[PDB]
Design an enzyme around this catalytic site. Structure first.
Site, short mmCIF file in Angstrom:
data_model
loop_
_atom_site.label_atom_id
_atom_site.label_comp_id
_atom_site.label_asym_id
_atom_site.label_seq_id
_atom_site.Cartn_x
_atom_site.Cartn_y
_atom_site.Cartn_z
N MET A 117 0.69 -1.35 0.06
CA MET A 117 0.01 0.13 0.12
C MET A 117 0.81 1.35 -0.07
SD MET A 117 -2.81 -1.08 2.64
CE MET A 117 -1.60 -1.38 4.12
N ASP A 118 1.82 1.46 -1.07
CA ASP A 118 2.66 2.50 -1.02
C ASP A 118 2.19 3.72 -1.62
OD1 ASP A 118 5.15 3.93 -0.72
OD2 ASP A 118 5.98 2.83 -2.38
#
Lengths: 218, 218
Positions: free
Chosen positions: B9-10
């Site tokens: 989840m960058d």
């Protein structure tokens, strides 16, 4: 400029199949293309290539195909002995035909003093295999009083794994699939991935330069 | 249709920074967006999501930032307790603040009977950590006469690792970087990778559907 490039040399089989040729026509490009890639890479200053030549899972291919590859792999010595590359093989060597084992050992012995590019050929290798053999060695040391459970850390594994620090900066996989396919699982923890649809026999200087420039953009 | 999607989840920090806002403005989208992704995924039939919320390396961020994240993570219970998702956390829980440990334990306890999508949140997790803790357990068993060195195989590791079979079919990483960044190293051996420049707060149904369709083309 990457110091260590990992190379998944995929697309040789498909290159031939797509043209309606038998698979040997594709596979025959493997060491010549890898040689070319090594020459270009050493000139660019790249210090290490780890190239995936035969996975522990590739024994599942047709018998004749597996037998062709194992015989072709004995061209190792003629291909690299006088190239000035320092050659190492990683993988389970004792599963290979004895003549290939001797060819590998000889190729390693004769090139070990070379100080240009270090080519590591992963032949009957997989990430699972590497972590498992390292784990067995750690367990053996523990059962012989050489370390305790609290001594088990990343550095210990880096000592016991076949593929060693420094780890790949960049991975290039030809042939269009976007997987690591049980290659250097531990070692690829921070490696930049680059995938190209270009099949390995068609992969040239322009393709490599493009991968590296893509890598240099962070 | 993937059964198990891994999610890096960058892009939350960069989403905020790019707009000239402080990082908390980006991070506040994390659990709401993940919730949205879970809802869409369960309707598509996806059975498991393993989402990377906090790496073992993220302790290196600024103290205030780390402290904000650890406090925000206690919203776990309010965010997922009544969602019908079955929640598990993987990672080293005993390094976390005790209040977060209790929030996690409570969230796990209350959702364990749910039979929809299984959300695994990797919080203070890394691939090295997972392989190392599994190795320690294997060594402990060996030192207690429960197995020999020859018993060390892939299935044994799959029993001792925190992230378990079935392994991710597809990995999605938002935010544009093309690395696995010490996520589920062992478990990603045959996973298809999908990288998007789309930042996590901007990642929607259309983006997810596009990743999956990209995956369904083999």
């Amino acid at each position: 400029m990457p110091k260590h490039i990992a190379l998944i040399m995929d697309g040789n089989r498909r290159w031939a199949k797509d043209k309606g040729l038998d698979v040997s026509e594709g596979y025959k490009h493997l060491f010549p293309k890898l040689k070319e890639i090594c020459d270009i890479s050493s000139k660019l200053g790249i210090q290490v290539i780890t190239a995936f030549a035969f996975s522990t899972e590739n024994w599942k291919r047709a018998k004749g195909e597996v037998d062709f590859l194992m015989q072709m792999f004995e061209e190792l010595y003629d291909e690299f002995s006088r190239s000035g590359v320092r050659v190492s093989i990683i993988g389970c060597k004792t599963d290979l035909p004895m003549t290939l084992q001797k060819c590998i050992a000889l190729t390693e012995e004769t090139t070990k003093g070379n100080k240009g590019l270090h080519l590591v050929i992963a032949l009957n290798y997989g990430g699972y295999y590497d972590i498992l053999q390292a784990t067995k060695s750690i367990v053996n040391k523990a059962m012989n009083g050489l370390l305790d459970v609290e001594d088990i850390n990343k550095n210990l594994f880096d000592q016991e794994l076949e593929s060693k620090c420094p780890n790949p900066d960049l991975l290039i996989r030809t042939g269009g699939d976007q997987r690591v396919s049980n290659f250097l699982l531990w070692q690829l923890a921070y490696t930049e991935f680059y995938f190209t649809k270009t099949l390995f026999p068609d992969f040239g200087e322009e393709d490599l330069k493009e991968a590296i420039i893509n890598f240099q953009q962070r």
